[PDB]
Design a protein around this ligand. Sequence first.
Ligand code: ATP
Ligand code: ATP
Ligand code: ATP
Ligand code: ADP
Lengths: 270, 241, 265, 264, 16, 247, 260, 232
Amino acid sequence: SRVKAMEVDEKPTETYSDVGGLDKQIEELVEAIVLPMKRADKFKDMGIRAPKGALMYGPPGTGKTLLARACAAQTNATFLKLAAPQLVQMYIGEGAKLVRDAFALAKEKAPTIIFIDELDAIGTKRFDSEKSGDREVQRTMLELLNQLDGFSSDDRVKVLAATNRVDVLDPALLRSGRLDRKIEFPLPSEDSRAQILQIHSRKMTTDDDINWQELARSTDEFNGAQLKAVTVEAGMIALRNGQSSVKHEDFVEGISEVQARKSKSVSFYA
Amino acid sequence: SGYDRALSIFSPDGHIFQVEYALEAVKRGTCAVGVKGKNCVVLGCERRSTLKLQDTRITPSKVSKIDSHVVLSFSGLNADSRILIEKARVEAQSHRLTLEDPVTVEYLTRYVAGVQQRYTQSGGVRPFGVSTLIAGFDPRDDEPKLYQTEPSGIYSSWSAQTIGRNSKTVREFLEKNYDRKEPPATVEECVKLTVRSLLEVVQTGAKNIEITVVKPDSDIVALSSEEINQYVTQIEQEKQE
Amino acid sequence: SVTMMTVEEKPDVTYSDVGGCKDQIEKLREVVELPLLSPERFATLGIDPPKGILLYGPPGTGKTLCARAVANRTDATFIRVIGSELVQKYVGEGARMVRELFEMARTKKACIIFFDEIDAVGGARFDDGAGGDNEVQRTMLELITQLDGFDPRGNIKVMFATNRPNTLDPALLRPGRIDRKVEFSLPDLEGRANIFRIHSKSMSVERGIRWELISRLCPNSTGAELRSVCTEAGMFAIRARRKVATEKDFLKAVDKVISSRYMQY
Amino acid sequence: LVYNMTSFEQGEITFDGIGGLTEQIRELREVIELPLKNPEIFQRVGIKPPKGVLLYGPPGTGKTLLAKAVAATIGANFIFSPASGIVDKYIGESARIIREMFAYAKEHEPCIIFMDEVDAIGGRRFSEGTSADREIQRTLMELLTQMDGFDNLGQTKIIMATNRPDTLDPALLRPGRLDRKVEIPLPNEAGRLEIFKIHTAKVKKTGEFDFEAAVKMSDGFNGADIRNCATEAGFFAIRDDRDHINPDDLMKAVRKVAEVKKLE
Amino acid sequence: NNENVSARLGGASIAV
Amino acid sequence: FLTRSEYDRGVSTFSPEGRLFQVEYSLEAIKLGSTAIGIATKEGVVLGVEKRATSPLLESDSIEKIVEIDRHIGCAMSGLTADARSMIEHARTAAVTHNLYYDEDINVESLTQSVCDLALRFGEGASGEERLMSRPFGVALLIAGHDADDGYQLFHAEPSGTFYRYNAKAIGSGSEGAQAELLNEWHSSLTLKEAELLVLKILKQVMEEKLDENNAQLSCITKQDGFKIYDNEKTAELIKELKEKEA
Amino acid sequence: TESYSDIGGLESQIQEIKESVELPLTHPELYEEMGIKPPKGVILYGAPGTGKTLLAKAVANQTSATFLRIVGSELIQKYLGDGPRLCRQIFKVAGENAPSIVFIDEIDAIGTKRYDSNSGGEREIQRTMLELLNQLDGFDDRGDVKVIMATNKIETLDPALIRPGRIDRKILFENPDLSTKKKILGIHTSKMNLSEDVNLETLVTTKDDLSGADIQAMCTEAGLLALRERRMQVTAEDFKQAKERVMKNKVEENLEGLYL
Amino acid sequence: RNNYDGDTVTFSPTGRLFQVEYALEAIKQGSVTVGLRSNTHAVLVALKRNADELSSYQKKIIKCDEHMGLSLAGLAPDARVLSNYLRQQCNYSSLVFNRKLAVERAGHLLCDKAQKNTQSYGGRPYGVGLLIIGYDKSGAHLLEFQPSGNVTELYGTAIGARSQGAKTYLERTLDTFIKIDGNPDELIKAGVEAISQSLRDESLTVDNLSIAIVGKDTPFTIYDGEAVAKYI
Ligand SMILES: Nc1ncnc2c1ncn2[C@@H]1O[C@H](COP(=O)(O)OP(=O)(O)OP(=O)(O)O)[C@@H](O)[C@H]1O
Ligand SMILES: Nc1ncnc2c1ncn2[C@@H]1O[C@H](COP(=O)(O)OP(=O)(O)OP(=O)(O)O)[C@@H](O)[C@H]1O
Ligand SMILES: Nc1ncnc2c1ncn2[C@@H]1O[C@H](COP(=O)(O)OP(=O)(O)OP(=O)(O)O)[C@@H](O)[C@H]1O
Ligand SMILES: Nc1ncnc2c1ncn2[C@@H]1O[C@H](COP(=O)(O)OP(=O)(O)O)[C@@H](O)[C@H]1O
């Protein structure tokens, strides 16, 4: 048994003051998945196929596993945060029975949202050595997805999914009706990088005479995962030298210690 | 790796590669030995007896003089050796022209190395797959000397030296026998010193050798095939058992 | 069961017997000892230390000894999750152990573990996600499912190892998953001069030696090519039958293990 | 089921509730429906019924909605085989999949294929890595023999959709089959309101009509444009909790969302 | 309980 | 985290570390080369070199790590002995022609700038020049000499451009050990004979073989006598002098 | 089963295994007197037809200890998770049977670079190469069990296990020099008649770019080649025709003759 | 792998150049140097690093002409090229026109040189940023230089390793030392508390510091050595 072992994460949540940037991505979401949850009438009464679900794709360390936690407690819609692996583990007579129970409960407690992890383990496009190891998994989720709407349901259950690879998956999920709104998480620009940097640091002790700007400029090919970690090790440097705060220096040497450069630093320069 | 496919880059150990790969080419060539007595120089060669269709009327010759008081010997490959021999003898007769004075041997030796330095430095060029050595006498003196040269472009002054196949056997040998405590005096012991030195390679073939020596007063003299054939025997005459 | 068998039980090795890595420890014991010994100074600022550090370096560079040198020092449970104990056949029998592995650790406090040579399982990046069944894919996704997604635990220290880091996932450079990437790399002179001395304590040589000669004579080398010296150097005297070592003996001991001359210098 | 929907031969989407064409769809009426309707002539002439067709052109045309739709009129089983999703790095096992489906199609009594992005098959072979490109023809060539061997059936029809026609010139596979190759259109400005009339239905919106829509639909002539404008124009009357559309949102929609449909 | 799985017992595979 | 291995096959490519590598490798060639020492009293400058006996049948004066480059200047090669010759042929083409374009004697700080103005000719030329070399050439000279402006000083000239006025240099196979301990054996108030002692001492701790008149060499500068190097005979009598002193 | 007095040649090569294996059982007080413990590991380069396996089987003749029999490919298995157990089995039992020796041969089968493949089977050897590492030096000492591993080519193989901690000396073999061909020839030929023609110091000679194994083929190929002539004993020209044969297709210097 | 960064011919996949963008981390592994302005007198200061506990220090400030100088930061030998270049223009627009070369005209053509190396296959970018000062017939100025070409006219800035620990002093105190004039004795004091906020325990030995100054009635001139213990 895992469904009872699994529970909604509605009670502890980020509270959404912790995310930084991402102006339009969430505005796309709320305009696409949230407003309809409170106006089920018009998207049955005005007459329109509502957005059944949506997908977000983008590289790691970027705010996929996070953002799906903000929106729920924001809106008071219970859920579960699911795990493709624990379906795919050596237990086999539950991957289907679980996902049947999944929408079953989420159908109850309505209105609700539901969300899944990386689809690396259940994308499963492959016609390789044995398909039947997993084809009974997705097909129930397909049928379970078909339960959501099609004959004027308005079940109030809505679905989302995150994954790095938007290409390895089954090409049977991009189909019409089931879902058509794949969201890109772009890597951040400099004005977007800095809000990420303050927000993982307000808990930390600092001074006020920083210019956070060029510290963003020093960071390209980095985002949130690459960012707080230097926001960590600056404080880690503060002790070995013995400070009671973090200076501008300690951040930037964080950058130099992401990849351990350790430059000669006096080699015939001036 | 990839650090060894050019002449204008350094490996992280600091050393270039395409040069000392030449030292592997020259190792594939024939011997070339030289010794200076008190007042006379000698030079050897690991001549081949390939086949009975080369004209005995013209034996080949590693050695090639450039002026009547200088000679030269080499090993490696012959094509790239033919050039600098001609850039040498050209340069010497110019020094007689401009200065009305023959060449000090050191000046010559820094011209052949003065090209083996550019033919590796500026790319678009391959080195000279050859090591050489110089031998002779300065004008107006008996001072003996021989100089070595190698494609890195440096010039040393050994008293005895070799280049090529099983040189490692020989450069240790003469160290065991030749020494400055007793410098030889005349030809028949500098040659009796040398003809035995070849024997690590010659495997008892006397159709596989030539030899020359040096004079003061700007002369030379070559040597015959029977005039060693006796020296094949006095050196073996000690080898009774 | 078998997991209970693999436990350190006090090997004898200090930090006195390690040399040129005089600062690379100062990263390693910064995360292990202090949160387990002196957590108040972080707490005076009140932040989350890193947990789940790593170390990578060339072979024979001197990393495994540190991983056991830290064992006797801490007087705390040391755990070795070694190979041939995570990828047994009969799926379910393989990945249950790692679940049971942490479960012992989740129960117990003041606990640190060790994963020797993760390149087996973590290094098995899915070959373009191919294979209709990937037995290592499922068991790698669980520990990140243990360690990421949500917190496994709050007081347990973890260190991995790798002779070859580029194998494993891009998900093991990332907080929760992994925090630090320490890099053991080749010494310098002042490190080597303090690696010779420890391996020559037992040796029966007589003074008149200046290892400063030797380090200038031994270029880029590992911390294990510098003990083999002490064997062969001490050995040549044996076939030559002397009851003591020289210095010159080292000079023809050094020539072998590193292993015709650059006359152009 | 394992692979694909198969439509149970009766899921009856409207091949005419669509702003597509009449000439092309009537060009297809020949090769499929006429024999399956009327075998009294091909029999009388003895010619065997046709062998497949190609439908070139880039998307927006609806070059897959008609296909399963007319298949629903006649009632065959509609499936997929996207060549992008068929290639496998191994030596064989790209041709095995071909062999499964011609067999498995025949496991069913009728069945028709919808291949797409088939340029993955028909490549120019500019790399010329003989370890690979010797195999690319190997799996391709198996298609040519797996497709028309002994199969004397009148049920197993074939379709191949191929954006970017004539990118393939390893082999044009012209002679014999491909009895048609439809000259596909794009959505003409006249067809805009032919299309907007489709999706606008099933709405109570105070009309939401205009002639400022084809000008807006100019250069955004793809069916997704109209599906999405009616989507988001539907999301603007609710932007203020209104009751019925205004046509200005349409003049706002297509003007302000064909942007992405013209720049990228 | 003789549900002896096939052990996923490997096997080679040609490339490209 | 792809590493240095890629941006290290070209003189004219930086790396995200912000640096070059080929020039940074050139410094790792003189390391292979034999030692070299130079320390400067007020009374006079000295030098010191190992010569790396390869075999006992080489006339040791065949090869030179010391040059009477001018009346009042000297040098000390360390590294590839070949490409050094492309400097001094240009160096003592300056100290001469400066006695023509100015009919006087030269100052070093032009000279060490001149040679260091040359080594960077493989790229941007100082005086708007062009390129003449594909290969920065690895040697590290020691331009000792006298000018009447500041007196007795030496230098250290890399192929990488910049120079430094050391008061006590050491470069070659011993820069790590020697230049550590000259820092506790340098006095502003030395003699000359307080100088040639240690330079033999330091050159003894550093290298392989027992010393000899043949396996070393050294010289001294003084304004009136010039670049006077020492015979094997004279140098031999200091070596003995060290021993009875060492008792 | 063989012994010494059956090689003759390898002397610079053979003093090591003596110092690794045959000796320390005898007089370990030597090694400790210095304060030193001998190697744990040995390896033998290739250059085939030069007597690698021969050396190992010799010491087995006189070792007064337990000695083992493995080639590199007995380690690997099929069930995808039982291979690497087998390695820990052989090392613990050797400890149980200590002092012991092993011999893993042709382990280029196993030892390769971390090729980072995509097959599914070539992975299960890389783990099998790895428990060895984790077993052999790894984390904990093992005691007095010694390795004598062999191969035929290493110049791009055997990545990381070749280091101290695991292996300490790297003996190498080649085709012999002229000096060794003398005594080695006496070995095989010391049972035949050799009627009067011996002349052996010209029979074998440089430019006979042959092996240290082909000679016994030449020795045996002659006797029957004389037997068929109804002459059991032997002369020189028996051997001349043989050397004419077996040398024929070893090498050809057609690309030589350019370095004049 | 951040490809497209083998040479300065190629763009990014966005519109960026990487070899340039990698040069800018060269200045960051050199020393620090700073420059101010007043409406009459300007100044610059630089800490010069040793090579050991025994060597000399690095010639860091250089007179290109009398009404104008500079102060480098980063790779020096590539600065000598530029320093020789100004020394020709200034020695060209006075043998011909006799006019004092306008300081702003200098940076108005160095940018037309760092560009023409950015284009073509060969050479490098001038991997150094540097500062320029100068008085002219218009008034005092400061002009900086970073390798990409963009120069800028400023009141005061600084560059090098750990320099933004000085810029904040300037942005904090900018309104004060710009009206100042007539008394360089305290302006020169300004940079010293500006730079001393940006140190790794360097402690500012007299030998470890170089100062250069210009003015209307004052030529360019270097103050180093024992004449600088004053301005500690
Ligand atoms: N917009 C953001 N605001 C705040 N933090 C962010 C943001 N984007 C990323 N982060 C940081 O990145 C991390 C979260 O990344 P996330 O978990 O969403 O990716 P992931 O799920 O780890 O990716 P994968 O599923 O491939 O493992 C957190 O440490 C978070 O602080
Ligand atoms: N500083 C040092 N002092 C003493 N010995 C050292 C030092 N560094 C390395 N060694 C030697 O290196 C050996 C261990 O190497 P280590 O296991 O750390 O390399 P490794 O990369 O972990 O090898 P593997 O990857 O196979 O585990 C020990 O036998 C030890 O003697
Ligand atoms: N000195 C020798 N005396 C007698 N036989 C020798 C000698 N050296 C080599 N051999 C011959 O060489 C053969 C052994 O070759 P080797 O040791 O290379 O076999 P191996 O270890 O399996 O290596 P390979 O796989 O390359 O043959 C023996 O059969 C033996 O007859
Ligand atoms: N002629 C048309 N009339 C109305 N809608 C269309 C038309 N063509 C395409 N569409 C819309 O576009 C979608 C089909 O996309 P399509 O262009 O067929 O993709 P593909 O070309 O890859 O098959 C349908 O869901 C439909 O809403």
